[model samples]
Target: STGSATTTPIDSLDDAYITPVQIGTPAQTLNLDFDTGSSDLWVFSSETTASEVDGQTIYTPSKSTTAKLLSGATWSISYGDGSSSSGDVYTDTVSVGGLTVTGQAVESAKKVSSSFTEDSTIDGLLGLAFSTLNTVSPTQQKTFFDNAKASLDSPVFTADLGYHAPGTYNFGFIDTTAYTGSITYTAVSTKQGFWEWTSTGYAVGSGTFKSTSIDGIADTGTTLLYLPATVVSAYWAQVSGAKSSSSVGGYVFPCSATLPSFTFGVGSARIVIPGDYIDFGPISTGSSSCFGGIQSSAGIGINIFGDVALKAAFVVFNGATTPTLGFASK
Candidate 1:
């Protein structure tokens, strides 16, 4: 009826968060990125090209009696970073935490991009976004949440992403102990197949809270927080010696600079992101210049409240007929 799993940052920079998932009858476990930005439960598998297979674990359907090929079914997904993965489909038993789903479509990668092959920490991705975003052709498939919601106590899941420590993802029921204060609920527009919502406004550090409405998606898959250019510039302007670096390809500042906190509104609730969270890390190994966790979303088409922002609060993805998102202090 309910399930909970621990998710940990892949590295000190919190590049990505990974959670263990069990697939097949024998229960082969693999660390997967529970991405809320896309829809497709794909994995590195035996079907993947040998050249693309590195140190990551592979899912072998041949070893699982319950695995059945979905003839003619295929899936392809591309990322903003230009990386991609495509493969045939298989229906098998999939489990996350303690929740189980039978006949879940697991896309077995036949091809993967160089970036994926190079990142040995992540075996694949489990999309938590709406099923409408599924790339499976001829027949789109539901996500793990969609398949398990029927049996869950409530059609809801929560994300508690940590900075450098292990976080928790709970399905079916919300963990009251996970957050501090009451949750601020807001309407979600799933038209774009994302957990898209509008923030009332934002504030740079302890400055006045801006009352402008900013629309964005709460994406756990994205590592950094992206906002409008003006908003991003406002935050960076407060940091002395901060500048947009062409070589670094983003906003960078001295690692010793005193960074200010960032705050965003969710209805009446205001969530604050600590300054340390904004100082991503050194640009190059021990370089004195650091990359900013919050960057300009001008070219990104849409504002994104990524891990840098998500890690600041408890997030709820309510999957009822009329879906909604809830945010709370932690």
Candidate 2:
């Protein structure tokens, strides 16, 4: 079976997209961020503290007849941005769009960091990263895609993200309508629990494409585009008034600055990120300073093509064989 669902962007911050998912017998619905960076189907659940609950929906396991507790099993996850969550496990019926997978492990979060609690729009994260990255103790958990792949016509998913607009996430099959032109494919290394790949080269504006290999991951969960400090310096050099602001913790520039285009090499395909998208947003209300979307990833050891980069193209997370990535324009 194949399935697809429209993903809508939350205006609070253009950080991530949300898709509707159903859990339990009567189909308790919740909006989930499909994160390919982490592996754990965690949700805001009844187990969460009332004080911790914000405006997000919560999943109630007691209401689901099919929900079965995995006694003594638990899961915990943490991120670079200090976001973390931990909870008990339950095997339940989970559905995305028209596809449903039974006996899928659902982590019910009893504890969530302030970062997650404050941003109430997201109910939880549906991890698409490899099962090996799952945080389930004793026995690692498989993702929804991993559990449903054998039953699917094909083990592939396509991510079509739009800028301040709605996009689509297709599972089991690739929708040709979601993309245009030819899809240039590249090999991926799942060594770091991510859909990691390397860009052949990169360039700023109309400058010559520099032949430097940039190893990075295409992470849907991450919001900003993080590149090497050297590459970041080179790009900011082209923009007047752009400087690394210690207060802001990243490169900042004038909101009115005429920015240059940044391009990444994916095989023979050159994916360009427009300058307009590079200006993430204002540093503060009525301030001339604008936060930069492109930041240095020196600390993380790997560059990240987050939503800022992924929005400009159609991405295919192909788990068919060895997990490859295919990129194209729409």
Candidate 3:
């Protein structure tokens, strides 16, 4: 079996990508973020505090006859950004695009941080990472992909993230027409419960490619690209008025500054991120300083190849026994 879904950006900056998901017996459709960096398909639900609910949609398991409470099961997840959510668990029929999975663990949020309440773009997150990363206590549950993998035509899914436009996520099979040329495959390490891989190297604009190994995770949930401080500094140095600022919380440059393209290697393939992509947007409303889409991963422990990099190419998350990653130009 196979399925496909359209993922649309929630804001002008492409802050997050949301895809429609169907949950429950009668199918309560809600927009969810397909996050590759985490495990645990969590959602805002009837169980959530009323004060924390904004304009976002919520899933009411009580309305679904197929929904069954997972007694004694609970979950909690915290993101790198400091936002968190915790709740009880329920097993229900869930569907994405045309792919349906029975008895899928649907975490119903009982409490959520302010960031989640303020953002109505996404109802919750659908984790695509390995099930080993699941936050459920006592009994870990499988991700939608993991649960559906056996019945799929092939154990693979592709991410075609767009910049300010709608993209696609395909399951069970690859869409050859979505990408160009040949795909460069790389070994993936799932020990960290992430789609982690080592980049061959990177180049600044027209500069020479620095052959080095940069280990990072392909995180669709994160908005920016984070690399070593040295690599980030080298890229920013090419910009006339760019600087890392504590007040700004990251690297910022003049809004009018001429930004340079960044290129990273996947095996022998070079994926170039356009200059415009690096100019995230103004630091504040009507401000002349623009925040950068790429920053230093110094304090973050591991580098992250987020949406800024993923949007530049087609990414394949292979779920084979010995998992691997595939990158191709789109």
lDDT of 3 by residue, 1-330 (tens): 998999999999999999999999899999999999999999999999999999999999999999999999999999999999999999999999899999999999999999999998889999999999999988999999999999899999999999889999999999999999989999999999999999999999999999999999999999999999999999999999899999878999999998999999999999999999888788889999999999999989999999999999999999999999999988
What lDDT is obtained when candidate 3 is compared to the true structure? 0.95
Cα TM-score per model: 0.99, 0.98, 0.99
Off by over 4 Å in 3: none
Q: Give the alpha carbon lDDT tens digit for every residue of 1-330 in model 1.
A: 999999999998999999999999899998999999999999999999999999999999999989999999999999766889999999999998999999999999999999999999999999999999999999999999999999999999999999889999999999999999899999999999999999999999999999999999999999999999999999999999999887888899999998999999999999999998887889989899999999999888999999999999999999999999999999
- Candidate 1 colliding pairs, count: 0
* Total backbone collisions for each predicted model: 0, 0, 0
Report the lDDT tens digits of candidate 2 across residue range 1-330: 988888888774577899999999999999999998888999999999888899989999999999999989999899878799999999999999899999999999999999989988899999988888999998888999899999888899888888888998889888887777989999999888889999898899999999889999998888889999999999999999999998889999998898899998999889998888787778988899999989999888779999989988899999986889999988
Global fold similarity of model 1 (TM-score):
0.99
Off-target runs (Cα >4 Å) in candidate 1 are none
Query: What TM-score should be assigned to candidate 3?
Result: 0.99
> lDDT of all the models against the reference?
0.95, 0.90, 0.95
Candidate 1 yields a Cα-based lDDT of: 0.95
